Design a protein around this ligand. Structure first.
Ligand code: NA
Ligand code: NA
Length: 97
């Protein structure tokens, strides 16, 4: 569903987001497509920021750090299950996460 990209920076960020989504192995039992979710999250970030510079990388990094948060597994699970859509997650504030 997310558009493809041929931008190497965007591709790496999609892969990094997919990897963060694998935290704790929850994605397997849930049956989530972690690569597709990663692409949808990245797409929403790129659509809002519209470049791959500092603000873009910061946003990607903050989504990743929260997905990897051992203290907040329900955040990741909500994204994996689709309770939180990827475009919402892309723009969620730290407070909201
Ligand atoms: Na965090
Ligand atoms: Na945990």
């Amino acid at each position: 569903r997310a558009p493809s990209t041929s931008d190497s920076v965007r591709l790496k960020c999609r892969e990094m987001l997919a990897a963060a989504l694998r935290t704790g192995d929850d994605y397997i039992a849930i049956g989530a497509d972690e690569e597709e979710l990663g692409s949808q999250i990245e797409e929403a970030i790129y659509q809002e920021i519209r470049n791959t510079d500092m603000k873009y990388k910061n946003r990607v990094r903050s989504r990743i750090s929260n997905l990897k948060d051992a203290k907040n597994p329900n955040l990741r699970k909500n994204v994996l299950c689709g309770n939180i859509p990827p475009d919402l997650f892309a723009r969620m504030t730290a407070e909201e996460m």
